[PDB]
Design an enzyme around this catalytic site. Structure first.
Site, PDB file in Angstrom:
ATOM      1  N   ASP A 134       0.803  -1.224   0.000  1.00 41.82           N
ATOM      2  CA  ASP A 134       0.000   0.000   0.000  1.00 41.82           C
ATOM      3  C   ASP A 134       0.839   1.279   0.000  1.00 41.82           C
ATOM      4  O   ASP A 134       0.462   2.275   0.619  1.00 41.82           O
ATOM      5  CB  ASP A 134      -0.939   0.026   1.219  1.00 41.82           C
ATOM      6  CG  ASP A 134      -1.935  -1.131   1.236  1.00 41.82           C
ATOM      7  OD1 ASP A 134      -2.437  -1.515   0.154  1.00 41.82           O
ATOM      8  OD2 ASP A 134      -2.218  -1.652   2.340  1.00 41.82           O
ATOM      9  N   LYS A 136       1.622   4.604  -0.992  1.00 41.72           N
ATOM     10  CA  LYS A 136       0.934   5.705  -1.670  1.00 41.72           C
ATOM     11  C   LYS A 136       1.138   6.986  -0.847  1.00 41.72           C
ATOM     12  O   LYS A 136       1.398   6.910   0.361  1.00 41.72           O
ATOM     13  CB  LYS A 136      -0.555   5.394  -1.869  1.00 41.72           C
ATOM     14  CG  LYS A 136      -1.324   5.049  -0.607  1.00 41.72           C
ATOM     15  CD  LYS A 136      -2.767   4.699  -0.961  1.00 41.72           C
ATOM     16  CE  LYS A 136      -3.492   4.010   0.187  1.00 41.72           C
ATOM     17  NZ  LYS A 136      -4.740   3.306  -0.263  1.00 41.72           N
ATOM     18  N   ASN A 139      -0.105   7.448   2.633  1.00 41.54           N
ATOM     19  CA  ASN A 139       0.430   6.515   3.626  1.00 41.54           C
ATOM     20  C   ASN A 139       1.801   6.898   4.161  1.00 41.54           C
ATOM     21  O   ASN A 139       2.285   6.310   5.122  1.00 41.54           O
ATOM     22  CB  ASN A 139       0.520   5.106   3.032  1.00 41.54           C
ATOM     23  CG  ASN A 139      -0.791   4.373   3.091  1.00 41.54           C
ATOM     24  OD1 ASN A 139      -1.798   4.920   3.543  1.00 41.54           O
ATOM     25  ND2 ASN A 139      -0.795   3.130   2.627  1.00 41.54           N
TER      26      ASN A 139
END
Ligand SMILES: NS(=O)(=O)c1ccc(NC(=O)COC(=O)c2c3c(nc4ccccc24)CCCCC3)cc1
Ligand SMILES: [Zn+2]
Length: 288
Positions: A134, A136, A139
Site C-alpha cells: 500500500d 501511496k 500513507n
C-alpha cells in the site's frame, strides 16, 4: 503497568469504522509530557471477523518487530476488556501527499531523497518477509524534521469501502501493482512497482495510469503502456522503465538483491546510504 488513564487526550487525529486515533501526552512517570499518537480499536468491531482479527494481530507483530527510522515506531501496546491500544510516535510533518499537492512536481533531487529513504524502509520490511503493498502518498508521513515514515500496517482507514468482502482495494488503487488487481499471485515485487508509480507521480504531477474513473484506471494499470514524458532525466527515465514493468520477475528489485538492486541504480548515485539511514541528510522540506 501502562493503562489508558496514563494518557491525557489532546485532540482527535483521525477516525474510521474500527476505532480512533488521539494525540495524547503522558500524565506522569517516565516521559511526563511526551506527546504520542494513541490508536484505540474497538474489539467488538474486530473480533467477529477472523480476517480483521488476523490483520490486527499482524499489525502489532510487525510494529513490535520493526526497528527502523523510516517506519512508524510503536512504543506501548495494551488492551482492556473492550479496546486495543497502540501508543505510536506522533508525526508532526504531515502526509507526503500534502507535499506533492503544494509543489505539484518535485525537483529530481527532492524526489530522489524521499524515494531513497522509502527504499531503505522497504528493504528492512522485505528481509523480514513483510510486504507493504500500500505504498501511496497518503500513507507516507513526515516526522518533525522532514524524514519519511511508513504507516498503515493495520485495519482500513477509509470512510467508504470497496465491496463487502475485503478492504484490500478501498483506497486509491493508482499505485497498486497489476498482479494484485489481477489476483494472479504476488510477492515483494509489488512494492518496487508502487515505488515506481510514486516516483512517476512526484516527477510528473500524476500517477502513471490515471483515468476519468476507477474502471478506466484499473484498465490502464493492467494494460501497462508506459509513456515517459521527455522532460524526465536519463536516470529517472531508466529507473522508471525498470520499476514499472508488468512482469514482476523482470522488475528492478524483484531479483535476489531486492532493495540493494534498486539502490545501486544511477538515479541514486549521489546518495550516501550511511548518512541517510543515520538521518544526517537535510530533508528538502522542513515542517518547521
Ligand atoms: N482502522 S480505524 O481504527 O478505523 C482508523 C484509524 C486511523 C485513521 N486515520 C489516521 O490514522 C490518520 O492519521 C493519523 O491519525 C495520524 C497518525 C500519526 N500522527 C498524525 C499527526 C497528525 C495528523 C494525523 C496523524 C502517528 C503515526 C501513525 C498514524 C496515525 C482512520 C481510521
Ligand atoms: Zn475498507
Amino acid at each position: 503497568k501502562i493503562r489508558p488513564e496514563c494518557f491525557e487526550l489532546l485532540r482527535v487525529l483521525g477516525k474510521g469504522g474500527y476505532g480512533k486515533v488521539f494525540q495524547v501526552r503522558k500524565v506522569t512517570g517516565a516521559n511526563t509530557g511526551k506527546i504520542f499518537a494513541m490508536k484505540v480499536l474497538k474489539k467488538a468491531m474486530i473480533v467477529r471477523n477472523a480476517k480483521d482479527t488476523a490483520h490486527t494481530k499482524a499489525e502489532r507483530n510487525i510494529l513490535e518487530e520493526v526497528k527502523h527510522p523510516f517506519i512508524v515506531d510503536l512504543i506501548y501496546a495494551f488492551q482492556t476488556g473492550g479496546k486495543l491500544y497502540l501508543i505510536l510516535e506522533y508525526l508532526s510533518g504531515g502526509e507526503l501527499f500534502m507535499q506533492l499537492e503544494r509543489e505539484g512536481i518535485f525537483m529530481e533531487d527532492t524526489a530522489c531523497f524521499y524515494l531513497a529513504e522509502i527504499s531503505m524502509a522497504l528493504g528492512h520490511l522485505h528481509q523480514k518477509g513483510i510486504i507493504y503493498r500500500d505504498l501511496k502518498p497518503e500513507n507516507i508521513m513526515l516526522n518533525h524534521q522532514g524524514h519519511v515514515k511508513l504507516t498503515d500496517f493495520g485495519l482500513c482507514k477509509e470512510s467508504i469501502h470497496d465491496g463487502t468482502v475485503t478492504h484490500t482495494f478501498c483506497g486509491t488503487i493508482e499505485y497498486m501493482a497489476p498482479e494484485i488487481l489481477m489476483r494472479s499471485g504476488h510477492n515483494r515485487a509489488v512494492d518496487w512497482w508502487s515505488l515506481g508509480a510514486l516516483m512517476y507521480d512526484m516527477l510528473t504531477g500524476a500517477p502513471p495510469f490515471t483515468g476519468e474513473n476507477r474502471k478506466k484506471t484499473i484498465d490502464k494499470i493492467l494494460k501497462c503502456k508506459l509513456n515517459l514524458p521527455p522532460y524526465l532525466t536519463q536516470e529517472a527515465r531508466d529507473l522508471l522503465k525498470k520499476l514499472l514493468k508488468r512482469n514482476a520477475a523482470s522488475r528492478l528489485g524483484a531479483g535476489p538483491g531486492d532493495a540493494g538492486e534498486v539502490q545501486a541504480h544511477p538515479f541514486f548515485r549521489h546518495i550516501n546510504w550511511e548518512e541517510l539511514l543515520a538521518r544526517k541528510v537535510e530533508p528538502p522540506f522542513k515542517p518547521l
